[PDB]
């Protein structure tokens, strides 16, 4: 996150707020000229691997008797398709 | 020609000492996976317990029939109709 918010301030010393969110978690850092304050950063364990598992036991619980065994992948491109 | 009855008794003495093996695998196999599906979903087996589901069966039915055959010929009958299977039901105490 900070590498990022580099990458778009590259004279290192700036102000601002990083909302990151990732795989498995997501982050809120504020970065105080250029240096991020990590005491008062804070996590959120939820990520996209999170939200594939909910959508995969919602979609078992909404049809229990599915006679197709679905796979990772097509919940994943469920997933990436049609939510918003 | 021939006479009713007496081939009758003759496959009965013909299927009485033979103690093989007499509904087919496969369509009790198939009504044994659709009648565990309701209570959970993708259930395996093994080839053990469907023989013996299949010997249980076997023998709650032969058990019930000579019992009905008993309740036939008590009211002097032969033929056996439904009221003789709920008498054997009844008798027997399932109800």
């Given at each position: ?20 969110c ?7 850092i ?10 008062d950063?804070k ?18 619980l ?18 990436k398709d049609?939510?918003? | 020609?021939?006479k009713?009855?007496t081939v ?6 013909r ?5 093989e093996l007499?509904?087919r ?8 996976r ?5 209570f959970?979903t993708?259930?395996?087996?093994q ?5 013996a589901l299949?010997?249980?069966v076997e ?5 019930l029939?000579?019992d009905?055959?008993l ?6 009958r032969?033929?056996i109709?439904?009221?003789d299977i709920?008498?054997?039901r009844?008798l027997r105490?399932?109800?």
């Open positions: 996150s900070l590498f990022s918010f580099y990458n778009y301030n590259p004279s290192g010393n700036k102000t601002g707020l990083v909302i990151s990732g795989h498995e978690d997501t982050n809120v504020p970065v105080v000229d250029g240096a991020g304050i990590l005491t950063a996590r959120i364990n939820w990520g996209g691997h999170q939200a594939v598992d909910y959508l995969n036991d919602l979609m078992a909404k049809y229990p008797y599915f006679p197709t065994k679905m796979s990772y992948l097509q919940y994943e491109t469920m997933y049609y939510c918003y | 020609r021939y009713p009855g009758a008794l003759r496959e009965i003495r299927f009485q000492k033979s103690t007499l509904i695998k496969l369509p009790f196999q198939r009504l044994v659709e009648i565990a599906q309701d959970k993708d259930l395996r087996f080839s053990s317990a469907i023989g299949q010997e249980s023998a709650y039915l032969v058990s029939f000579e009905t055959n309740a036939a010929i008590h009211a002097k032969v033929t109709q439904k009221k709920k008498l054997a009844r105490g399932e109800r």
